[PDB]
């Protein structure tokens, strides 16, 4: 095909707190509570 090589890439690019999950009594597996985080920065290394 002789497709052109990729060039000139253009890239287009809060801080949700995980403290409530680690603070206080954890809910039991039967009484599990989900937590939803949207549009938030996350640190996977920290957890």
């Amino acid at each position: 095909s002789f497709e052109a090589k990729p060039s000139g890439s253009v890239v287009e690019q809060v801080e949700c707190d995980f403290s409530p999950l680690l603070s206080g009594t954890p809910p039991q597996v039967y009484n599990f509570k989900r937590l939803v985080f949207t549009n938030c920065n996350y640190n996977l290394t920290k957890l």
């Binding site: 509570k33 989900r34 939803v36 949207t38």
Partner: protein
Amino acid sequence: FSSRYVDLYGGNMFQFATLPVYDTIKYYSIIPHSIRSIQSDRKAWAAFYV
């Protein structure tokens, strides 16, 4: 979804807000609303359709 936020005249529905309710809701109930006004003050109100 609110039509007024993006296309009020069109009536097209576009999401404007999200509520983080983890539990599913299987029951909905209309709430009656009254207006406290004198007989002359009373005015007709639009009828909502669901």
